Amino acid sequence: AMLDVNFFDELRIGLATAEDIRQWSYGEVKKPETINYRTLKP
Amino acid sequence: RMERVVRERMTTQDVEAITPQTLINIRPVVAAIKEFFGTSQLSQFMDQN
């Protein structure tokens, strides 16, 4: 998870709903910008 | 490639004004020879031990 251990006992795949997606994200990217051209900061 | 470029430019260029100096682009030949001698499978460093 966010915090992990060596007690992992079941890896369960399954399609993800968008309801699960906008609760994973810690934000939202909206601009196609990588890094400033002059100062080289995000 | 040179011929292609030469003829395209010739068609665009106005007549009674142009010359092979203004037609020939020598970039393609240089590029080809360079990409051959460098960056090719069949031009290897002479192994000289």
Next chain:
Amino acid sequence: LRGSRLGAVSYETDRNHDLAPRQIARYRTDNGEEFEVPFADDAEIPGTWLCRNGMEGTLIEGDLPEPKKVKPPRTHWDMLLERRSIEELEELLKERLELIRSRRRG
């Protein structure tokens, strides 16, 4: 080749005890979801905030400090109205009006 993502690294123990106390602030989004934003104590808490969802969210605490609306993007109406006058579009409107109503009465 040797490269590295432009950045820096620190080597200090992550003391979990002696820190600067935080203060969780609530920021309701337009849909109404709550997104916790930990702030320090001596810290001017903003009324609005860009939340985790990505839409603007206001404090759950009652502030409502003015929407601060901006001027509208130039519209097609704006780009038309300058070159042409209202009364000038009037005659054209009446021409189309008579055209369509002549179709109607027919």
Next chain:
Amino acid sequence: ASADSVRAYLKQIGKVALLNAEEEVELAKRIEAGLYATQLMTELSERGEKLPAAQRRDMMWICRDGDRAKNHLLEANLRLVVSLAKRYTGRGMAFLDLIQEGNLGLIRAVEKFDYTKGYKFSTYATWWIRQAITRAMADQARTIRIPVHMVEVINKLGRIQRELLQDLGREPTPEELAKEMDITPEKVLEIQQYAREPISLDQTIGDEGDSQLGDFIEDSEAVVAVDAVSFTLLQDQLQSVLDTLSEREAGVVRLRFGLTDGQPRTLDEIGQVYGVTRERIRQIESKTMSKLRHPSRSQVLRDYL
């Protein structure tokens, strides 16, 4: 297959018949009449009128007919968009994205428009569509976004260097290009440095497709293992040595160099929390430093530096 969305689009836009200045005048008049009609409907909607049925119905007809004419003209000139956009492919953006941005420029050209000047639509629109395609190709082409003024001067440098490469035969020098463009050589160099295209970490550096550049890049920021443990040992040794100092001395050193919270306290704060004058703090500071410079407690910590 028919997977080429280029075809899926061209065969679509080849449908609507192409128009002329006659139909253009009629269309523009209809569009303008409709926009005026909806403006007045909005005006009379507010605080306004219980409209007559025939009048209201047919002015709504005009309002919708204006949009019909607008869309008709847009469909008519999609072909023109393609004809103008074909010339900016082979580099940067892809053809389809360029067509969409040119379409946006065309919406702008038809929006911000006039017909009383008595000019065919393409004359004016061509300018807008070319501008829109160029704007897009400037902004949303290079990964690291470089703004448009810088982009235009980049293109001017590229043209000058290329043309003078052919003219001179030899590649131009930074001062030759600086004098030509009436700029400074360091600016020539800066622009050239900004023309560098980020290589891809995804490239088969080996002949067979197994060796990638990303697998040979030492990250010169990683934990050095020995450096971290060495820093821990330094912390311990320094703590012991400082504990050799007297209580006042240990306190002044720790506060002066922020060993207790990471905040470096200065002389006035230290004198305030001890209730003395800053001159006394500075004297205790100098005395303690000199004491630590003594080889007894110094040579232990020399190696860390």
Next chain:
Amino acid sequence: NLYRELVDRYGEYFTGAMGAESIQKLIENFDIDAEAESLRDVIRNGKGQKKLRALKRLKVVAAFQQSGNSPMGMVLDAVPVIPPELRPMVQLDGGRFATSDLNDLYRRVINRNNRLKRLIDLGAPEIIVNNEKRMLQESVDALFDNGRRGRPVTGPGNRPLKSLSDLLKGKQGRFRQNLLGKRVDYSGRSVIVVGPQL
């Protein structure tokens, strides 16, 4: 054209749409239960090709029924973005930056989504909006796999890009590579000689 004439003369009595939202609705109005019972009936009483076609369909439908996963996962609304470090922008000394080619694909999708939003606000004719929705779909498909559903999306040197799938497929995916062998620290090698004394 027929659809237009049908709507504007019969605007009531039905709803009909085009594209990913209409199929969202289709899945919304799809009942796995009833379809599954019908498929059981077919495989139980049908014969020949119908029974087998029901079988393969019967498989995936019950698969969704037993997972209780509501196939909506096929219509992908809000799309998640992989963490920045897994797609590094390393700067090789000299200023030459190094993308990871997932940056470029993500940028394509984001550009097309922004432009689609813009066109929707303007109210462009159905041609442009539908073309841009098509391009969104195409680029999302490209990012989740490049080379499927058409020719590969390429770049410099006409090299195909590296969609997320090409990081998790074939021989160069994680699932057939560094999850097999790992360079290890505290290691060395050397040429060997015979010791008839040990």
Next chain:
Amino acid sequence: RMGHIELAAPVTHIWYFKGVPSRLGYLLDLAPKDLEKIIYFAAYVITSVD
């Protein structure tokens, strides 16, 4: 930490649709080529009727 993108219109996958066999194609009972005309904006669809 991950992000997300709030799309302005819905979109579909490429794995559960085009990959043989079309899982969606079975699901909604349509052939793959037929759906490749519905989810790439080249054919309408009636959603309900009385």
